[PDB]
Amino acid sequence: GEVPIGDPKELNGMEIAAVYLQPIEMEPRGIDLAASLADIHLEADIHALKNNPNGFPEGFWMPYLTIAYELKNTDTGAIKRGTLMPMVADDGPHYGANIAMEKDKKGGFGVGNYELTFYISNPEKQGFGRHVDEETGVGKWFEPFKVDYKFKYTGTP
Amino acid sequence: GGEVPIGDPKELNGMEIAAVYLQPIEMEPRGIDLAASLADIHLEADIHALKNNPNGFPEGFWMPYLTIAYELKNTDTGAIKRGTLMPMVADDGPHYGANIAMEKDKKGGFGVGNYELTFYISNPEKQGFGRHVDEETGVGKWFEPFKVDYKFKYTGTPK
Ligand SMILES: [Cl-]
Ligand SMILES: [Cl-]
Ligand SMILES: [Cu+2]
Ligand SMILES: [Cu+2]
Ligand SMILES: [Fe+3]
Ligand SMILES: [Fe+3]
Numbered sequence: 001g002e003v004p005i006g007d008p009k010e011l012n013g014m015e016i017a018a019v020y021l022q023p024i025e026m027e028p029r030g031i032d033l034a035a036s037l038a039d040i041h042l043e044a045d046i047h048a049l050k051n052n053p054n055g056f057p058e059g060f061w062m063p064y065l066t067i068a069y070e071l072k073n074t075d076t077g078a079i080k081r082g083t084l085m086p087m088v089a090d091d092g093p094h095y096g097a098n099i100a101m102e103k104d105k106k107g108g109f110g111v112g113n114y115e116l117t118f119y120i121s122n123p124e125k126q127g128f129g130r131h132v133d134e135e136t137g138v139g140k141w142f143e144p145f146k147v148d149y150k151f152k153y154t155g156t157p
Numbered sequence: 158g159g160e161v162p163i164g165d166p167k168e169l170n171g172m173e174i175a176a177v178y179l180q181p182i183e184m185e186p187r188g189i190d191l192a193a194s195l196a197d198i199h200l201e202a203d204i205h206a207l208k209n210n211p212n213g214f215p216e217g218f219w220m221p222y223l224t225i226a227y228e229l230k231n232t233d234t235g236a237i238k239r240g241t242l243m244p245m246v247a248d249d250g251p252h253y254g255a256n257i258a259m260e261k262d263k264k265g266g267f268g269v270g271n272y273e274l275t276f277y278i279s280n281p282e283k284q285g286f287g288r289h290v291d292e293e294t295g296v297g298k299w300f301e302p303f304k305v306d307y308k309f310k311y312t313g314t315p316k
Contacts, residue, residue: 001293001294021294022293024289024291024293024294024295025289025290025291025295026287026288026289026290027282027287027288027290028282028285028287031285031287032287035291054246055246055247055248055249055250055251056246056250056251057249057250060218060219060250060251061218061219061221063219063221063222063244063251064221064244085285085287086221086222086286086287087286087287087288087289088212088213088214088281088286088287088288088289088296089213089288089289089294089295089296090213090289090294090295090296091213091294092213092214092215092218093213093214093218093221096287123246124185124186127186127189127243128244128245128246129184129185129186129189129190129243129244129245129246129254130184130185130245130246130247131182131183131184131245131246131247131248132183132184132185133182133183133193135158135180136179136182136247136248136249137182137183137247137248138246138247138248
């Protein structure tokens with residue numbers, strides 16, 4: 001059910017990919033946009049690479065990230081921004097948001113060419129700690145960064 | 158190393174729940190954990206998904222966004238302290254942990270001896286971590302809050 005968004009990027013010890021699927025229903029209620037109001041569920045799939053410098057085992061989900069997105073229709077110039085929220089689905093933990101496309105009451109988010117940007121800040125922003133002792137410590141976290149994708153939105157799946 | 162195992166791990170609610178301690182650790186950011194020089198142990202909860210986890214976590218994955226309170230009771234002296242373990246990462250992965258004063262704590266009898274350790278665990282939804290519940294991609298309901306208990310002999314800081 002998942003449509004790839006552009007090509008994944010490897011950086012800061014992480015594999016960072018984007019996909020969209022049909023709208024999902026999330027609990028708790030009142031956080032994620034309700035499925036009937038949305039056209040897609042956008043997901044950031046973020047996992048540790050080999051030799052992750054912050055101690056995360058290869059393939060582990062990267063938790064406690066702060067992630068904002070910007071979605072730009074490059075045909076219309078229409079831009080929207082939001083946050084992705086941490087949650088779990090059948091395919092495990094990720095960061096996600098239901099997003100109105102055709103249903104965006106502002107308009108301009110229908111079928112077309114898009115640029116997607118993630119803006120990502122490290123887990124310390126949320127108070128997640130790291131050992132820094134000689135025996136068990138790990139390296140410094142990345143500074144906030146962005147990653148960019150280009151994709152064609154072909155309509156609510 | 159490695160760490161000192163506390164009691165036996167428990168397998169409950171789709172998770173392996175183990176307790177360990179080691180020497181006090183230095184943690185960043187500075188100021189949230191008790192300083193290493195003021196502590197005698199670093200206590201950890203090691204919690205990972207079992208096979209067939211009912212909440213969509215693949216086997217071996219760390220269970221994130223858990224709320225974990227601990228109670229440490231010296232059964233010889235009666236000394237009791239409580240706290241909450243904080244999520245963090247070390248060179249062998251993410252865990253929940255806290256630096257704790259034992260011998261250094263002069264406000265109680267927290268020296269070498271027999272201990273009961275209890276973890277009080279609440280599911281990730283308590284912290285607003287979400288779950289899909291639609292038919293196509295949804296997963297099972299989270300566990301209700303629960304406790305796990307360990308017995309161990311504290312023999313001092315690993316040296
Ligand atoms: Cl791309
Ligand atoms: Cl035990
Ligand atoms: Cu999701
Ligand atoms: Cu720790
Ligand atoms: Fe997914
Ligand atoms: Fe550990």
